[PDB]
Amino acid sequence: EVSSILEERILGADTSVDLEETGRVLSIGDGIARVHGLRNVQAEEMVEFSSGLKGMSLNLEPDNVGVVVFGNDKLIKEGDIVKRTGAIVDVPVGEELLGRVVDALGNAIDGKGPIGSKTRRRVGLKAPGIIPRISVREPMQTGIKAVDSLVPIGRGQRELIIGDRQTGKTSIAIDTIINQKRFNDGTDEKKKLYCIYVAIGQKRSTVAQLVKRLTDADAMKYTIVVSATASDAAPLQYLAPYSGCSMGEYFRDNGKHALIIYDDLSKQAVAYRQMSLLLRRPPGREAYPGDVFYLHSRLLERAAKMNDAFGGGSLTALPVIETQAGDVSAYIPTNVISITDGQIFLETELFYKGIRPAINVGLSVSRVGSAAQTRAMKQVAGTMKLELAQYREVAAFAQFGSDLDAATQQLLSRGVRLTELLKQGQYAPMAIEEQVAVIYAGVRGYLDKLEPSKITKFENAFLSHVISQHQALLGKIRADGKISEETDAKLKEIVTNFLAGFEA
Amino acid sequence: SVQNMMRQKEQEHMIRWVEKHVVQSISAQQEKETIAKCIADLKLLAKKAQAQ
Amino acid sequence: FAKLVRPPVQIYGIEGRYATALYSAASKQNKLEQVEKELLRVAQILKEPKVAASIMNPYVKRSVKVKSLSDMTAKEKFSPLTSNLINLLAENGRLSSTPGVISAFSTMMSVHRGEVPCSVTTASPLDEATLTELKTVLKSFLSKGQILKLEVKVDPSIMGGMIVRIGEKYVDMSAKTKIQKLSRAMR
Amino acid sequence: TGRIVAVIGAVVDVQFDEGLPPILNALEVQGRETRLVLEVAQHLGESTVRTIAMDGTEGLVRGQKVLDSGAPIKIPVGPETLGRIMNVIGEPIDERGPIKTKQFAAIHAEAPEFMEMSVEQEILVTGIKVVDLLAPYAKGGKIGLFGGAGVGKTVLIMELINNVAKAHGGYSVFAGVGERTREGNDLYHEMIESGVINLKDATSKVALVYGQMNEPPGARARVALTGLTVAEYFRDQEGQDVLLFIDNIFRFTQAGSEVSALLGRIPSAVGYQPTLATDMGTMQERITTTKKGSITSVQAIYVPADDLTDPAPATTFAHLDATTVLSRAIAELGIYPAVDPLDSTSRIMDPNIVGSEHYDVARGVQKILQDYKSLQDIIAILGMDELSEEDKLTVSRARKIQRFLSQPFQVAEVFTGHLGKLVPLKETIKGFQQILAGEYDHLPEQAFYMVGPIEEAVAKADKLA
Amino acid sequence: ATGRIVAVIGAVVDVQFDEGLPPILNALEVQGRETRLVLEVAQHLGESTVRTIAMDGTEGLVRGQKVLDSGAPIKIPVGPETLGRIMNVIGEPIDERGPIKTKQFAAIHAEAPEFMEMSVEQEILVTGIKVVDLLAPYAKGGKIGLFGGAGVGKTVLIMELINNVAKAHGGYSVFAGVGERTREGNDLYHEMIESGVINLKDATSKVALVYGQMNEPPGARARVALTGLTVAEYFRDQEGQDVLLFIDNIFRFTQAGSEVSALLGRIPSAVGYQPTLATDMGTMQERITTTKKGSITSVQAIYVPADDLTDPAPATTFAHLDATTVLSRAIAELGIYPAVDPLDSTSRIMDPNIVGSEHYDVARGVQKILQDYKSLQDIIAILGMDELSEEDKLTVSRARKIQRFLSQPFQVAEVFTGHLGKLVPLKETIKGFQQILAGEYDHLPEQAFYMVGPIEEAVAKADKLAEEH
């Protein structure tokens, strides 16, 4: 029935005539067309040429209009016809996009079929003000033992993942998508999360490897991926951050929850600098224009925690920023630091010393603080944060230390063993009830006699025990939320029973 | 995976024949051009009455 | 400063600054038709090999190129305000761009009665009944009391249709209805 | 009227016919939903002005219509502006109805003349024991507040509002220059739960001006002028002793060097504007003590890349008269407020300004607090008992002094349960004049923790055991 | 459609047409020369005036030479007949052996394959080098990068992989040389006849060659790399074989476009490159891929200017590479050859589900003892070597034997060394490094591992040093 569906489309096609407000082309070069005419175009309005490419008019000058091109300029000759559409740029949005691969303009690139979305939304909208917001209180669970213990993330906070090349910045933001599967197949409607992933200027083979990683873990039925790759034109890597917040604001407007990841924002300031200097705008520091702060501020301020009178929705934003030689005092690493709330600083030195994920907790902060942790995690990690911070003071005495006080030998002894609890393999996100049990085994003092090399083998043995043989205790910390006095004694003989006969 | 993959092979080969075969068929229809002008302006007569 | 009347086209450039400054002085004193008849004859009396030479030749002087032009515009027909215009073009060195100022002024004076003509580019010229029918429906579209002019061009690359522009309108009925068959592919 | 000829980014060019408006006026675009105010900055010739926008610029067609106010940006000012939230153009942004008042004022206003300045220094008393003794506040001067989040800064803001309205009777304005929306919402609700703003009656003590961070770079630079017009009403018309809070001053400098680069100007040194020394001049000279009243300013200062000689924290430093620094290492010691006594400086600390009674008391406190800082290292490395008997009292007295600097605030009565104490000036000088001489040394340490004057110290030694 | 020349400034020639305007990226033939001079259109300027870039020199050009148009971009000849021939940018043969006679002509400007034409499978391609196969394994159909400064060994290490890999490979091979010394294109034509890879007598050759060197005008060092991967696109697409591709150098594609830029009318960006730097780089590097019609292994040498990997030309190629092999001058000045940095080389298949759990815990066991050796050098500078404890006098002596065991005597570097060429297999590289870490060779001095092959020769070299005391 292949002939029937092709005959179906062409009778269902609309072949109607209209008017236009055209204007000829003056000088096409390097992706900037100059059009004479078009006397009633608004700023940032989408036009379309005679070949089929589309264009967004950025400069409204007296005798001409500067329009960037969504493609390649070898199809644009001098003396063409630039018709008018009559509308600012708009993307399809809805529930139907869940589990698809889209480019920066909402077309389908995965070849399954066209989007059946019935709604449409602008990309240039504003943030909510001061009144429709409320303070962040619910936890956003990542699944990394070092993030949820020391640098937590609430549901509406902006948290920056900053670090050099090749240190696991993409991998931290790829198991946070995997970890929300345990809520997304259940019943509790106010604990589900939806993830969006924006790739800005990466090669096509890398995105084709990451969709297969999220297809394997059955985590591409609630995730959308917006791909503006390296080969695509310079303005399509500019729209693609603003084409993802417009899909993450449909879930905030309708009482649901969301998550978005910009990978990465340091390749949007470069794809926008090229568009500026070809339109002859006045440069500034490192040849960036005067409004690169206004480019990133009005994208991150769209992440908000709404209140109950508007729906109770949320939007959480995680931008990735690549530094060069660990210098965060550059132009773009200081714009996005002063906008967001806290940073996660992944070093390269700790990655080869064995600490993986290589989160430096000396420089990582979060300014929502402890108000986004559950009551169980808050009780044990408040002492762990104080215990680790006393270790980092005395880390420089470990290389030659045996003639020190027994308190200082103790402070070294707990700091090494708390570090081994923080290491974690890739694509293994845990639960908060299993996370609080492992921290409780360490911060109390139940490990200062076990050898520091065995802390990993002890932990994988202990976790597989309490899943099968103590399942009714990890339902009274998940549902309770806090850890009571009854569960404090019940957990106390558990880690004493396992530690007694362990080495076998 | 064989019944649905091979259907897309002749879906694209269907349109590969037609769009190269339309232009060789309409090139000699100059007798259709004398009505193509006569049908265009009546839509323009329908069109210029819209703004007026 | 004083105010100046705005032209209905408002073109730009170094030649539009001189076709606007004359339109702001000849709309005053009601002399917009006297300058136009003079300017279509100063275009003729410049392109003679005695006079086209030694105006673009840079090695004469500024002042003796004025005196060879201050009597040439004085003896034949002209003593209006327009004699100061040729006197001002030769002072600023802009005597080369004098066809640019003249050709701009005709279209700026055209729009006082003109209509920004059409373009029908389909095929070989057809019979008279098809031409008079389009000339009597496009008269219904202007609604401005102005007798429209029109041009016809021949372009065989369009298969069987025609494109029509009215000023800056550009309706379209052409071979782009074959390019709209991507709905059989893109769906 | 005028017409728009060119739209390039956040810079609009307007063509007029007869009424060419002067510089620093304010136009208004006709045909749009929300107010879009353009500010004239250059006369480009042939009746064309160069304007910087104040909101979004998209949707603007070449050849629209633009009116003219004939005056600069005029805001609603008055005494009924206390307790409301406004942006840079005077509009209310908290959905509590339109602000209604009698008169308006323009934001671009000249400095006071030379014959109106004060001819003498004068100390402002705020009640806090650590501020009004070691780093005192001059009336009219500019104050720099070092320290950021997690140190307890937003309590010190909310408490200096409360004490000046008690001991002096002068209200305050808060100006948020390019501040976050998430952190500019919590300060709204932290002031509600402490009484300084009130939704039921007319006993509010502040007015909020919030120019938030996602606004165009012309609209983040004029917020510190809109929030200074309101502070000039309560001095020129009523004669109060006003305060003024800017948070922070680096986002006023940095928002200046993006208007001066969108307008096509060659940058100065490291990236700033050519006019870095007059934009800091034609703002901070309106903050002065005239013959009617005064305006005092507390400003937050962020130093980029830890460079104290960068031109943004070097232009600002020539205007300040006193700096107070919030150390986090005193917040983990238990002391509140967490003001460092050794690393705070004052310019008016002088025997010919505050007199000899304030001087030789506050001089000896910083000297004794250095000797405990030098003797705390021998005790940590070597041990305790080797030092002399004359040095054991200096170890004991300096732990009495650095706990006598603590003070319970009136803004925290609900949480920590204590009573908020407001200490006048003559009690704080009398108190530390006796701790130095060994007059109250036999009492233990916890009699001095979190009290008011020296009278309530000996009334707390009786309750122990 | 003829056109005239109205301006010549440097390598940028302006050409005014009258009736027919050719589109951007075409070929224009200058009539009037004895040689062939082709102009490539780059911009439009209005009133029928284009602005071109010249492929050859511009001496002897006069204002008014009539210029023809082609109607198509630079179509080089392509096919099976081009094997064993050196050719120019525009397709002329410069081996002086006659015309390249083939049937297929192909433009050098073409699109990139879509998202549903990508392949996803990963493998491991074994080479025989001890530093490469252990810590950063290469892959079949994967893009490989060779970083490092000037004079550390990028041309020799890319000469080694033609020695090992290209003769044991089934399909064909293409070498594009972009902007390097014209001497070194003759030591390749004379080291591939005596090894029988290029054959001058019949039709059994396996290597094509495309050369645009550093004596060419800068409009011709930026279209040669597009001509290399056009011949290598014919074998992958119109045929089905497994192709290799060697490119040296590729920094001279970015630099040669930063010279014609300011005359085309563009404001410079950061430290001096063009504003369109990361777009035309990403337009070439999206054709060197493995699709569902073939597979292209690709090794590339990338010059890093004055030892700074934060320069904007090398620090944007990192997004297009799977395996990076960062060379270093701080290792090469010790005598450790090949100077590959172990703590700066990565791969996408260092993965215990792909290389097995035994290779994975050996790779990270080497980097952990080398990085912990780095922090110990800060103590020896003040204390000394002997004042250390006996426990970390052993982790130094285990690390120094791991530094020296990575250095392997290459085959094509015989004339430098005189030593012989070794080729250690993959199963022996892991078993050599387990035994130095576990402590089974603590009774040997450090010199017994310098420039050896497998671990068997490390003890045979140990006894031969002993007897000469």
Ligand SMILES: Nc1ncnc2c1ncn2[C@@H]1O[C@H](COP(=O)(O)OP(=O)(O)OP(=O)(O)O)[C@@H](O)[C@H]1O
């Ligand atoms: N927790 C972990 N433990 C061990 N290895 C890891 C871990 N996380 C990531 N890796 C490894 O690190 C390598 C690179 O990580 P990743 O690509 O996430 O870094 P990146 O900096 O985001 O990359 P890019 O620089 O391309 O953005 C991957 O090969 C991955 O296998």
Ligand SMILES: Nc1ncnc2c1ncn2[C@@H]1O[C@H](COP(=O)(O)OP(=O)(O)O)[C@@H](O)[C@H]1O
């Ligand atoms: N196998 C090798 N190991 C270490 N160094 C080498 C080797 N082969 C060559 N070199 C050194 O590398 C230097 C540059 O060689 P080459 O690779 O041709 O230059 P470049 O890498 O700069 O293109 C030479 O001086 C030579 O001493």
Ligand SMILES: [Mg+2]
């Ligand atoms: Mg990554």
Ligand SMILES: [Mg+2]
């Ligand atoms: Mg070389």
